[PDB]
Amino acid sequence: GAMNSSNYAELFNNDIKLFVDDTNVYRVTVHKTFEGNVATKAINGCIFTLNPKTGHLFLKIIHTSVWAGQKRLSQLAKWKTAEEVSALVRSLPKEEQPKQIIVTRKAMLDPLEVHMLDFPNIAIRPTELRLPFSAAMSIDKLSDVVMKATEPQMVLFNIYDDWLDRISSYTAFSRLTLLLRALKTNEESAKMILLSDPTITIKSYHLWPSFTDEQWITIESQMRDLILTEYGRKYNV
């Protein structure tokens, strides 16, 4: 059933699994019309499909053309997400197909279950974790490729850069969720922490700066400080 704090290590075992996050699939700006009514303009979206063990990110870019002449877009978005995830699994060789897909939002369960009826052995699960994957569009290189897309496109990343050379998946996933949580709570402060020192750069083939083990500890500390502060402010405590 549901993935929670109690069954956390299951993410890092040797059963292939994917997290699917649909929170950036359907994106709009809300504006005033000339007649002073409100209208939405859709902007490019993405499906965030992540192997938490390897860090392989299947970033399916959702071009605004997919919504042309469609109704009930927030509902269609869930089914479009399920269709694209289904198409991704079918594109993978049998030994690479996930044994579980964990959706970050319960509204994805029926759309994904119905699209994956051909795969009765793939378990579709919800989670109780509040994962910050909505903040993926605060990563400059992912945001850039989504916004520049002129057509539907699948782009492959490792969201852990080369970390797995030095740390376990468990530690890599905890670093990622702390970075995304920070970016979600206070984007400007988070991004200031990450880039303040211009001597630590981002490699052309990476998403995050090339921090030493010592500099990651300092960065990780600055992200925890950022998150606790913003919480005190949020909640007058």
Partner 1 sequence: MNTVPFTSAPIEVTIGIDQYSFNVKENQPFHGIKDIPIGHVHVIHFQHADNSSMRYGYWFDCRMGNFYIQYDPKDGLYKMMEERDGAKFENIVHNFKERQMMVSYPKIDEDDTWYNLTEFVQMDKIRKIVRKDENQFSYVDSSMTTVQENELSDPAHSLNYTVINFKSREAIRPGHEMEDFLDKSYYLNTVMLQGIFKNSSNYFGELQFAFLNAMFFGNYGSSLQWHAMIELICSSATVPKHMLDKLDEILYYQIKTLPEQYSDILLNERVWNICLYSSFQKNSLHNTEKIMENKYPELL
Q: What residue type is 2 in one-letter code?
A: A
For the CB of residue 114, give the shortest distance to partner 1 in the complex, in Å. 5
Would you say 53 or 115 has its CB closer to partner 1? 115
Q: Which of 66, 69, 60, 71 is closest to 43 using CA atoms?
A: 66
Would you say 110 or 197 has its CB closer to partner 1? 110
Rounded alpha-carbon distances, angstroms, from residue 116 to 84, 97, 102, 111 = 11, 12, 13, 9
Q: By three-state DSSP, how is residue 47 classified? A: strand
Residues 77 to 116 in contact with partner 1, rule: CB under 8 A: 79, 82-83, 110-111, 113-115
Helix 169-185 with 213-235: angle, nearest 10 deg: 40
For the CB of residue 64, give the shortest distance to partner 1 in the complex, in Å. 19
The answer to whether 57 and 207 have CB atoms below 8 angstroms apart is no
How many residues of this chain bind partner 1 (CB under 8 A)?
12
Handedness of CA 191, 53, 214, 177 (dihedral sign): positive
Q: Using the rule CB under 8 A, is 170 a contact of partner 1?
A: no
Q: Using the rule CB under 8 A, is 30 a contact of partner 1?
A: no
Calpha distance 48→56 (Å, rounded): 11
Would you say 108 or 146 has its CB closer to partner 1? 108
For the CB of residue 216, give the shortest distance to partner 1 in the complex, in Å. 43
Q: Using the rule CB under 8 A, is 70 a contact of partner 1?
A: no
Would you say 114 or 228 has its CB closer to partner 1? 114
Q: Using the rule CB under 8 A, is 60 a contact of partner 1?
A: no
Q: By three-state DSSP, how is residue 28 classified? A: strand
Of 74-82, 175-183, 185-193, 224-232, the segment contacting partner 1 by CB under 8 A is: 74-82
What is the x/- site pattern for partner 1, positions 114-153, by CB under 8 A? xx-xx-----------------------------------
Residue 215 has which token pair? 């500099």
Q: From the CA atom positions of the chain, what is the Rg in Å? A: 19
Q: Residue 42 pairs with which residues in a beta bridge?
A: 28
For the CB of residue 112, give the shortest distance to partner 1 in the complex, in Å. 10
- Which positions lie near partner 1, rule CB under 8 A? 75-76, 79, 82-83, 110-111, 113-115, 117-118
